[PDB]
Amino acid sequence: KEMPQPKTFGELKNLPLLNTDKPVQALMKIADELGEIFKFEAPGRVTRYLSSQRLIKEACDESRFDKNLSQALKFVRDFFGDGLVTSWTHEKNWKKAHNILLPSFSQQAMKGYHAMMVDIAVQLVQKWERLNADEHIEVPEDMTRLTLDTIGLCGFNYRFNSFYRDQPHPFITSMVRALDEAMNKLQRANPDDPAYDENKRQFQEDIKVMNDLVDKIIADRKASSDDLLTHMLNGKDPETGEPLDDENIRYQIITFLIAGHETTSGLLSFALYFLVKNPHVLQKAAEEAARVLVDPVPSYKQVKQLKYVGMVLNEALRLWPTAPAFSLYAKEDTVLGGEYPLEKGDELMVLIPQLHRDKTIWGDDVEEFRPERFENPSAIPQHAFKPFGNGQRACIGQQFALHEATLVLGMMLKHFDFEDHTNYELDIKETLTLKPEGFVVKAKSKKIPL
Ligand code: HEM
Ligand SMILES: COc1ccc2nc(SCc3ncc(C)c(OC)c3C)[nH]c2c1
C-alpha cells in the first residue's frame, strides 16, 4: 500500500508543519487524522511516523532495525557528543560506556542512592511545609529543583542547591534554551541564513555555561565516593579493558545531568496534574502512601511497596511520555506490516504518545487516567508501552527515574493535601521533552513530622 502523508507546501514539502512551538502535539494530530503510519518529507529528507503497536512491534525487532539518530538527536549531539544518548550503536564509545556505566544502575547501586534521594526529597517536603497560607507551588519549577539536585548529588556528589534559589538554576536556564534551539532548528529551511547568526551565538554561550559546570564537577571530585562519576573516571570496559577518555567523560556528564533529570521532572509534574484532576485516584494513592510510609523518612523497601503510586507514574508515562519519540533505521531492505517496503537505511520515528493511545491495545477509554490499567502488567502486549525506548538502546536510568519519582510522589501524598486552586488548563511545553507549563497547586500540610 501507499502511505499517507499530510498536507504539503510545494517545494518545502511537509517542513512548514514543524513551524510551531508544539511539534509533537502537531504530529499527534496528524497521526489521529492519517492513522498508523505516515510519511513526512522535508527538502532532502524522508521519515515515516509510526503510531500503532502492530507496526511498532516490528520496528522494535533489533534483528531488523537499530537505533537511529533523529534530526533532533543530531542537533543535541552538538552538546551531548558521543555520550550514551547520542552515540550510534556501532560507535566504539557506545558499548564501551554502556559496559562501564551499567553497574551504576544495579539494585545495589540503587540501594546506595536512596539516602541521597531522601536528602533532596526532604528538601522539597520542607520547602512546601514552610510556605505561608495562600502561597502556592510552581509544580514543574520545583520538580526540576528536585530532579536536577538528585542527579547532581547521586551521580556526582555535587550540590546544585536548587532549593536555595528563587529563580531556576543557571544550568537549567541554559539547558532549556539549548533544547529550545535544537527543537527550533527542526523547522529551519535555511539553517545557515545569516538571520540565525544570533541563535548560533546564544547556543554556543549556553553550551559554555553547561560545560563550565561540568569542569566544576570534575575539579571538585579531583579535589575531594562510589557513584556514577567514580565509574566514569576509573571504570574499565570488561570487553576492551579500556577506561573512557577525557573527552567522552565530559559528554557523559552533560548527558547524564540532562537526561538524568529533565524527563523525570516532567513525569512528576504530569503525575501530580493527573492526580489533582482525578480526586478518587489521588485519594487511593494518598491512602497507600499513608499505609506504607510509616517512618519519618522512607526506606528503600518501603518505596518498593508503593505499588499504586508506581501505577500512577506508569499511567502518567502512558499519556504523556516525557521523551516522546525515538527513531530507528532499517538495517536491510525489509517489509513493514506486510504492506510497507523499506530500503536499507530508511528512517522510522516512533510517536510514543500515539502508540500509547492505540485503542486495539488499551480499549476505547484511552484518554482516561486509569492507573488500574497497570494492575497486572503481564497482560500488556509486547512493545505496547515504550516510554523508555527499546532493546539494547533502552533507557539506562529507568529504575533510577522510577525510584526517585515513586519516593518523592509517595512523600508528597503522605505529607500534603493538594488543591487545583486555579482549575489549571493543561498547557504542554515542548523542549524536545514534554512538561506541563504554568501548572500551580496549593498544598495544605497534614502536619506529619519529618
Ligand atoms: C521518566 C524519566 C525518563 C524517561 C521517560 C526516559 C526516556 C528514555 C528514552 C525514550 C530513551 C531512548 C532514546 C532513544 O531511543 O533515542 C532513553 C535513553 C537513555 N536514558 Fe532515559 N529516561 C528517563 C530517565 C532517565 C534517567 C534518570 C537517566 C539517568 C540517570 C537516563 C539516561 C538515559 C541514557 C544515558 C540513555 C541512553 C541509553 C543508551 O542508549 O545506552 N534516563 N531514555
Ligand atoms: C520531529 O522530531 C522530533 C520532535 C520532538 C522530539 N522529542 C524527542 S525526545 C528525544 C530524546 N529522547 C530521549 C532522551 C534521553 C533525550 O534526552 C533527554 C532526548 C532529547 N525527540 C524528538 C524528535
Curated annotation (Swiss-Prot):
- Where do the segments described as Cytochrome P450 lie? 1-450
The impact of changing I396E is: Ineffective covalent modification of the heme macrocycle. 2-fold apparent limiting rate of flavin to heme electron transfer for arachidonate-bound enzyme
What changing R45 to Q/S does, per the record, is: 2-3-fold decrease in binding affinity for N-myristoyl-L-methionine as substrate
Upon changing A259C, the result is:
No effective fatty acid oxidation. No effect on electron transport from NADPH to FMN
Impact after mutating F256E: Ineffective covalent modification of the heme macrocycle. Substantially slower FMN to heme electron transfer for the arachidonate-bound enzyme. Product distribution biased towards omega-3
Q: Which residues participate in (9Z)-hexadecenoate binding?
A: Y49
Localization, per the record, is: Cytoplasm
Q: What induces it?
A: By pentobarbital. Expression is negatively regulated by repressor bm3R1 at the transcriptional level.
Q: Give the consequence of mutating A323V.
A: Substrate binding affinity increases 5-10 fold and the turnover number increases 2-8-fold for palmitate as substrate compared to the wild-type
Specify the effect of T263A. Contrary to wild-type, significant decrease in the formation of the high-spin complex via substrate binding, and decreased substrate-induced reduction potential shift with saturating concentrations of arachidonate
- Per the record, what is the consequence of mutating T263N? High substrate-free turnover rate constant. Negligible substrate-induced spin-state and substrate-induced heme reduction-potential shifts on addition of saturating concentrations of arachidonate
Applied relevance: This protein is a target of protein engineering. Its selectivity-directing and activity-enhancing mutations have been extensively studied and the designed mutations allow this enzyme to act on non-native substrates and/or in order to enhance production of synthetically desirable end-products.
* Consequence recorded when altering L186Q: Higher activity in the hydroxylation of highly branched fatty acids
* Family stated for the protein in its record: In the N-terminal section; belongs to the cytochrome P450 family.
**What is the purpose of this protein?**
Functions as a fatty acid monooxygenase. Catalyzes hydroxylation of fatty acids at omega-1, omega-2 and omega-3 positions. Shows activity toward medium and long-chain fatty acids, with optimum chain lengths of 12, 14 and 16 carbons (lauric, myristic, and palmitic acids). Able to metabolize some of these primary metabolites to secondary and tertiary products. Marginal activity towards short chain lengths of 8-10 carbons. Hydroxylates highly branched fatty acids, which play an essential role in membrane fluidity regulation.
| Designated name of the protein | Bifunctional cytochrome P450/NADPH--P450 reductase
